[PDB]
Amino acid sequence: APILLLDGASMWFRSYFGVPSSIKAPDGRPVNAVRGFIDAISTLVTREKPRRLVVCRDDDWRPQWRVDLIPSYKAHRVAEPEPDGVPDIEEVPDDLTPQVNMILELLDAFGIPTAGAAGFEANDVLGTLSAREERDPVVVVSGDRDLLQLVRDEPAPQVRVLYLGRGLAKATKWGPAEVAEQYGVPLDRAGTAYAELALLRGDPSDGLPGVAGIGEKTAASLLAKHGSLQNILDAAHDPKSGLSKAHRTKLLGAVDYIAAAETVVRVATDAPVTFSTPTDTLPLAAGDPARVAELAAAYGVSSSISRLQTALDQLP
Ligand SMILES: [Mn+2]
Ligand SMILES: [Mn+2]
Ligand SMILES: [Mn+2]
Secondary structure (H helix, E strand, C coil), X not given: CCEEEEEHHHHHHHHHHHCCCCCECCCCCECHHHHHHHHHHHHHHHHHCCCEEEEECCCCCCCHXXXXXXXXXXXXXXXXXXXXXXXXXXXXXXXXXXXXXXXXXXXXXXXXXXXXXXXXXXXXXXXXXXXHCCCCCEEEEECCHHHHHHCECCCCCCEEEEECCCCCCCCCEECHHHHXXXXXXXXXXXXXXXXXXXXXXXXXXXXXXXXXXXXXXXXXXXXXXHCCHHHHHHHHHCCCCCCCHHHHHHHXXXXXXXXXXXXXXXXXXXXXXXXXXXXXXXXXXXXXXXXXXXXXXXXXXXXXXXXXXXXXXXXX
C-alpha cells in the first residue's frame, strides 16, 4: 500500500473550479471546494487503499528566500506582499479563503495527518517526505507539473506523481518513464533532469522567465547530450567544448539567473517538516467524531464526511 502525499492547495483550488459555487453551507457560504476536496480524499482512499496519508500544507506559499533569488517568482499571483517572515497575501477568491479554513478544521478534527515546514512551500514538504520515505511506494497527488521532479524508481521505494492536470478521474501515475517519454530527459535521472529542463525552458505560470533562447526541446537535447546541468555550464565555460557558439552565448548571458534559479526551481528535500498528528497513519475513524459532525453540519458537507467514513470502512 502506498502512502499518499496530497498537494492540498493544488487540490482544493481544483475543487473550487470543479464543483459549482451553488453548493453552499446553511449560512450561505459556498463550500464547493470543501465538498470537492473531501470527495477527492475518499476517491483517493478507495482507489489507492493507503494506510498512510498526509495533506501537505503551504506554511509559506511564496518564501522570500526564493523571491530574493528571482524577484519575479510567483509575483503576478501576489495580492499584497508582507514583510520579513509573514507570508505574502496570495491573490485568492474571497469565497475560497474561508473554505481553506473549513478544510483545515475538518482535517484537524478528523485527525487526518497534515504536514508543513515554516518558510517552505507544500512542494518542499512533498519533496522532503518523498525523499525520506523508505517503506512504502509514494504517490504525490497534485496538479503541479513541477512535482514531476520527484519521480523515482531506484533507490526503492518508488515515487509516482498522480497528476491532476486533467482532473482526478483521468489522473494517471507518472514515473521516470512517463517523464522521460513526455519531455525527453534521460531516464536514469528523469526527476532531477526534469527540474533542470524546467529551469532552462522557464515557467511563466510561476514567474520564472527561464533562459532566453533555450526552449524545452533544446533543453532536452542539451541534457540528452551533456547529461546534467552542471555539465552544460562547464561545457559553456570551457571554450573548446563541442557546444555551439549560439548556445554558449545564450548560456553565458544567463549564468547568474541559472545559479539563482537552481534553488528556486528545485524543491527542498531537507525541509523541517512537522506533522499535525503523531504519525502519518490514516485514521480509520474521526479522532473527534462530535466536532467532526458539528463542523460538517455547520459547513454543509455532512454527506461528504459520510462518504469518507465508508471509504475508510472498506480498507482491509
Ligand atoms: Mn513577503
Ligand atoms: Mn505549490
Ligand atoms: Mn512552478
